[PDB]
Amino acid sequence: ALDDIDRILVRELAADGRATLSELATRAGLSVSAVQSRVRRLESRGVVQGYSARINPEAVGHLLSAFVAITPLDPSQPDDAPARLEHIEEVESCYSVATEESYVLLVRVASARALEDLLQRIRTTANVRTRSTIILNTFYSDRQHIP
Amino acid sequence: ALDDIDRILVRELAADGRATLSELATRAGLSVSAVQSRVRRLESRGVVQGYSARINPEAVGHLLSAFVAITPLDPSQPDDAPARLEHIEEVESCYSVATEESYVLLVRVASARALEDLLQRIRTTANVRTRSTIILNTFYSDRQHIP
Amino acid sequence: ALDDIDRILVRELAADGRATLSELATRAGLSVSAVQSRVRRLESRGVVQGYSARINPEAVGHLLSAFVAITPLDPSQPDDAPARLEHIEEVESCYSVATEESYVLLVRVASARALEDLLQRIRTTANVRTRSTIILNTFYSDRQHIP
Amino acid sequence: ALDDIDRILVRELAADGRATLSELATRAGLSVSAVQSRVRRLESRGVVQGYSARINPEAVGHLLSAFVAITPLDPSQPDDAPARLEHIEEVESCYSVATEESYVLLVRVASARALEDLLQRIRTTANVRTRSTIILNTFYSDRQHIP
Amino acid sequence: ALDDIDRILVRELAADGRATLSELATRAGLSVSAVQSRVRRLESRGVVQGYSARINPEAVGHLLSAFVAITPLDPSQPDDAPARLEHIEEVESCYSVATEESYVLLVRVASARALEDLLQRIRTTANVRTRSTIILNTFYSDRQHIP
Amino acid sequence: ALDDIDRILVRELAADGRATLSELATRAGLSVSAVQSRVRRLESRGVVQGYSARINPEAVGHLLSAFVAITPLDPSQPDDAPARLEHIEEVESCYSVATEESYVLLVRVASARALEDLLQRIRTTANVRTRSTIILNTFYSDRQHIP
Amino acid sequence: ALDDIDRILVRELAADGRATLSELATRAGLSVSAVQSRVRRLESRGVVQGYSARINPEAVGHLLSAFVAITPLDPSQPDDAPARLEHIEEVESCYSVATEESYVLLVRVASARALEDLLQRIRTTANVRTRSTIILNTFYSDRQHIP
Amino acid sequence: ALDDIDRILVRELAADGRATLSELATRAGLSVSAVQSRVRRLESRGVVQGYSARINPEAVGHLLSAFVAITPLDPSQPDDAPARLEHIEEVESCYSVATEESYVLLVRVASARALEDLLQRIRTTANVRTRSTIILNTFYSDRQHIP
């Protein structure tokens, strides 16, 4: 389960991570004491994982974002590319996928010429071929849907 | 215009979006008022776009995630697609992309059968062909990097 | 022809468009009067077309450059895409080509998201499909070779 | 850092690279000394990269121009190719590019037979496969745009 | 029906098309009249198709030669293409071919720009897609072999 | 140059290699003495190279003609395939090319089964892979265009 | 079944269709009466279908043989290509196949230029795309194996 | 050399390979001796290659037929493959072919499992890679055509 008072909470917190123990308890129909517990139980069970402010990447100097799809070159070696690229800070996300390639990464970078460097570094560090698709614009990002 | 103080605030708010101002203050060597001021300006300029609990899509019943690349059936018409799909809730992100397709969506759904039904809804509301890549596993995501 | 004193002049002027009527006449082996004429004859015959300082595009805010290859969609219409895109100032160059596409344009633009707009504008204005290749770095540009 | 005055100087030098300082001065409302100073700073920072007579490649015997995309035979080695081709004179420009190939060259040559011979030289000196696109006509080029 | 005498005449006329009859006669052990007769019959049956000075395409200004394979846009229509291209003069030869394309042309032209213009003329007059292979060098050609 | 009386001569001789010193001098507007010199100067300068009668290949037993495209297998060896195949008499022509393959040969042969032999012999003698395209019909051959 | 005296007969007749009722009866171990019956029972049950002398196709003027693979163009129409091509006498064999194409035909024809005609006729008569593979040599043909 | 009489005999022997001489004689207006003579000459020259009962491959237990294209693992060695496969009995025909593969075989086998085992035997005895196309149905075969 996830009792649908727990549900109203996760919707509220997904839409506004700074929402207060206080103002939640109105919309929810509970007490500042009662709300505060569910939330701690929600963080312990792995349901809310973190609270993050959403930073605009262009404002901090990331003018090019890209999906980078990668496939290991040598199948006799352990396929450990996520772990291998983890220290690379410009990889924001790393997914395994069912398609032509094995993983998709979302990468942010200062310019077209920084991407070229990142790609070579991805390639020599994990041991992969790269294919990259450049993002032109983000129309909306992380609208978590709670069903 | 992002000075060293602003840089520090956005790193801390990326790592913890419920950082209270008193903690941010003592971390940037400012007063709580000056922090609150900086933070508000970060919000009203482009830089912090909102704050969100990072929610486990599995815990809430989204067992299948996919990327869907979409391309308009008639590309001559100025293109509507992000605005028209905005109201389908299981679409979480929408990027326009270079190369052969026009947009990539991330989508989350309860099952295989709910995915095929969503693909129909997407094909019809944006008037688009679709190419889907199921995500098998998320190794890490949203690791935002402030340089 | 192009008498190989005329040749030494075009090499000199290709390498340095600010080279003086004066200092040319040493390297060339002629008079400030004699040099000045050849040059005016070279500008009248269509040989030197202009003098331009080479501006670094990043310094003026063009952070992304791209080749954009385009092919008219309707072959019953006059193929006039160069003329049609001429007023678009971000098209720096426009070539017809023998390959998969009919023309190649070199385009410069503020960001990845400005490119997306430019592409739609190219498409609705000339009546074309677009394919774009993003430039990551210019290692050297316009080294005119005089044989 | 480009103020309004600097912007004016680079537009004028783009449109006429032999603008004399007295003309630039009266155009920016500065003294000839202040102009000369501005111009020198533009040169030593990245902004003006040199000055060139724009030469008609046909008048000097280059009747064939081509784009050549190149890709390394062994991409694992750190990539040398722009440095190694720098000394082939009929290569006019060298860009690195996203997508499937690594660089695009512009090349000018006297004839079809001289093109095949250049392709061999390129294949061997950079150790690369080549894809050529002949240019049939130049409608306009180098129209530099200062925004 | 080619006897030994006829075989000798066609070898000599292949190697020297201005062989005079007196030289051909003494070479085949015939009279000048019998030679002239044989030669006329060779002409009126299929065997000698005409006589030509072999001309250096470079000396006359054709610096670029190419093969162009062509394939009809609509292959259902009985195919016109050799008859329709017969009147484009820079087409030197026209073969129909097995495999994926329908014809191969040899074409000679003054430069890269004149090639792109010819490709347009070919695409439009025969209604065909084109695949071009530039010839870099001719090592030997027309070495006719009589077995 | 090539003075356009020289031009009328090469057109005439390209169309009819047996055209007489005599009958040329009408069409040309010169003397049997004057015509005869230009022609000898044309043969000395490399402009007319030979006179050949055009033999129909089917009439002499060449029932299959083919283009054979070839690429050396070992790039550490000297690329000398033209020289190596020169003694092979069924190779009528040998070109170097810019495309997927390095050379194109035109070959004539008694039958489909003789081609199979020729191909193996090409392969073991030069050291090459072969790709062959079979000619079904020659609609016209060697129409030299004098511009 | 097929009693293995019946088997010795079919082997014998496959190897030699002119083998006599007489000489079979030795090798087989039966009577001129007994052999003659099995054979008539073998022709009635559909086991031996015909007796044919194997004609060399080159000796009768078929200098090119080809496999021609074909696929109907319109799947709303009945797929009846075997029946439609049956009157075409140069189709020796017609098979349906599991692969990229729907049928394979073996075709024999006077020359490369007759094949081109046959192909167009196959295409307009059945309603198919064609792909042809040319036979260079038959090393052995119809060795029926009786297991 | 095939006159009208010879043409008639090969048609009749194609349609019925057990035609007795008396029937062939009265059909060609010859004596039985002259027929027997003609037939013997047809045999000793290339023209009639043998005589065969056409046997139903199904009736004798070959329920699966396939085409197998084969290509040598090392094509530099003069090619052995038809001689080496001659002794595998379930190979019925062997052609060499133009294009990408070197030979096509027709093969008949009792079942899917017997096919995989034959593919191994082929791969190993000729040292070849294989591409198989199962035959689903034979609509007509061996319809020999005498023109």
Short mmCIF file of N, CA and C in Angstrom, two decimals, chain D residues 56 58 62-65 110-117 119-120 123 134-138, chain E residues 56 58 62-65 110-117 119-120 123 134-138:
data_model
loop_
_atom_site.label_atom_id
_atom_site.label_comp_id
_atom_site.label_asym_id
_atom_site.label_seq_id
_atom_site.Cartn_x
_atom_site.Cartn_y
_atom_site.Cartn_z
N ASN D 56 38.83 35.80 -54.72
CA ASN D 56 37.90 34.94 -55.51
C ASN D 56 38.64 33.64 -55.81
N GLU D 58 37.99 31.05 -57.63
CA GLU D 58 38.09 30.92 -59.10
C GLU D 58 39.15 31.75 -59.81
N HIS D 62 41.31 27.86 -58.41
CA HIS D 62 40.67 26.84 -57.62
C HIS D 62 39.28 26.75 -58.20
N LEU D 63 39.08 25.88 -59.19
CA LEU D 63 37.75 25.68 -59.75
C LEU D 63 36.89 24.65 -59.02
N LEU D 64 37.42 23.92 -58.03
CA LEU D 64 36.59 22.90 -57.37
C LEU D 64 36.73 23.08 -55.91
N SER D 65 35.63 23.21 -55.22
CA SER D 65 35.65 23.23 -53.78
C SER D 65 34.86 22.05 -53.22
N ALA D 110 42.34 22.57 -58.03
CA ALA D 110 42.21 23.01 -59.43
C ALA D 110 41.25 22.16 -60.27
N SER D 111 41.04 20.88 -59.96
CA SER D 111 40.22 20.00 -60.86
C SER D 111 39.84 18.68 -60.18
N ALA D 112 39.04 17.87 -60.88
CA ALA D 112 38.64 16.57 -60.37
C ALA D 112 39.88 15.76 -60.09
N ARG D 113 40.82 15.71 -61.02
CA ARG D 113 41.99 14.91 -60.73
C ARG D 113 42.80 15.42 -59.56
N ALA D 114 42.85 16.73 -59.36
CA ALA D 114 43.60 17.18 -58.21
C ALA D 114 42.82 16.85 -56.92
N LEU D 115 41.48 16.76 -57.00
CA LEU D 115 40.73 16.35 -55.79
C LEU D 115 41.06 14.96 -55.40
N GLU D 116 41.06 14.02 -56.35
CA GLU D 116 41.37 12.62 -55.86
C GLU D 116 42.72 12.44 -55.24
N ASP D 117 43.69 13.13 -55.79
CA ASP D 117 44.99 13.15 -55.22
C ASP D 117 44.99 13.78 -53.83
N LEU D 119 42.48 13.74 -51.70
CA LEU D 119 41.78 12.80 -50.79
C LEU D 119 42.75 11.75 -50.30
N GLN D 120 43.58 11.24 -51.24
CA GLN D 120 44.69 10.29 -50.81
C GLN D 120 45.57 10.92 -49.81
N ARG D 123 43.68 11.04 -46.53
CA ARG D 123 43.51 9.71 -45.93
C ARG D 123 44.83 9.30 -45.29
N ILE D 134 31.05 17.72 -53.09
CA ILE D 134 31.41 18.84 -54.00
C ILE D 134 30.46 20.01 -53.85
N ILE D 135 30.98 21.20 -53.91
CA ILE D 135 30.22 22.40 -53.84
C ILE D 135 29.98 22.79 -55.28
N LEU D 136 28.73 23.01 -55.70
CA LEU D 136 28.44 23.38 -57.07
C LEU D 136 28.49 24.92 -57.25
N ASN D 137 28.02 25.65 -56.24
CA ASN D 137 27.94 27.09 -56.30
C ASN D 137 27.96 27.76 -54.91
N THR D 138 28.63 28.88 -54.78
CA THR D 138 28.59 29.66 -53.55
C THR D 138 27.63 30.83 -53.70
N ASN E 56 42.89 14.47 -75.71
CA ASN E 56 43.23 14.57 -74.26
C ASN E 56 42.19 15.48 -73.61
N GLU E 58 41.84 16.77 -70.68
CA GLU E 58 42.55 17.95 -70.11
C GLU E 58 42.97 19.04 -71.06
N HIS E 62 38.56 20.01 -69.94
CA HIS E 62 37.74 19.16 -69.10
C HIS E 62 38.70 18.68 -68.03
N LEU E 63 38.78 19.41 -66.92
CA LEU E 63 39.63 18.98 -65.81
C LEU E 63 38.95 18.02 -64.83
N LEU E 64 37.65 17.75 -64.94
CA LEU E 64 37.01 16.87 -63.97
C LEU E 64 36.22 15.86 -64.70
N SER E 65 36.45 14.61 -64.42
CA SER E 65 35.63 13.55 -64.97
C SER E 65 34.92 12.80 -63.85
N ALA E 110 34.35 21.20 -66.77
CA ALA E 110 35.50 22.08 -66.50
C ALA E 110 35.89 22.19 -65.03
N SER E 111 34.97 22.01 -64.08
CA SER E 111 35.31 22.27 -62.64
C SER E 111 34.24 21.71 -61.69
N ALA E 112 34.50 21.82 -60.38
CA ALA E 112 33.54 21.37 -59.38
C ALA E 112 32.24 22.11 -59.59
N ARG E 113 32.28 23.42 -59.76
CA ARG E 113 31.01 24.10 -59.94
C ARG E 113 30.28 23.69 -61.20
N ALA E 114 31.01 23.38 -62.27
CA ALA E 114 30.28 22.96 -63.45
C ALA E 114 29.71 21.55 -63.22
N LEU E 115 30.35 20.73 -62.36
CA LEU E 115 29.76 19.41 -62.07
C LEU E 115 28.46 19.54 -61.37
N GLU E 116 28.37 20.38 -60.34
CA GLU E 116 27.03 20.44 -59.66
C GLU E 116 25.89 20.89 -60.52
N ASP E 117 26.19 21.83 -61.38
CA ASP E 117 25.24 22.27 -62.35
C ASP E 117 24.86 21.15 -63.31
N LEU E 119 24.84 17.93 -62.62
CA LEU E 119 24.05 16.94 -61.86
C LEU E 119 22.60 17.38 -61.82
N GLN E 120 22.39 18.69 -61.57
CA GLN E 120 20.98 19.25 -61.66
C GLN E 120 20.40 19.00 -63.00
N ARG E 123 19.52 15.32 -63.19
CA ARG E 123 18.39 14.95 -62.33
C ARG E 123 17.10 15.42 -63.01
N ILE E 134 33.86 10.83 -58.53
CA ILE E 134 34.94 11.58 -59.23
C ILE E 134 36.09 10.66 -59.60
N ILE E 135 36.65 10.87 -60.76
CA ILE E 135 37.78 10.14 -61.23
C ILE E 135 38.97 10.99 -60.87
N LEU E 136 39.97 10.44 -60.17
CA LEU E 136 41.14 11.21 -59.77
C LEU E 136 42.23 11.14 -60.87
N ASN E 137 42.37 9.97 -61.51
CA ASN E 137 43.39 9.76 -62.50
C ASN E 137 43.03 8.64 -63.51
N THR E 138 43.36 8.82 -64.77
CA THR E 138 43.19 7.78 -65.76
C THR E 138 44.52 7.08 -66.02
#
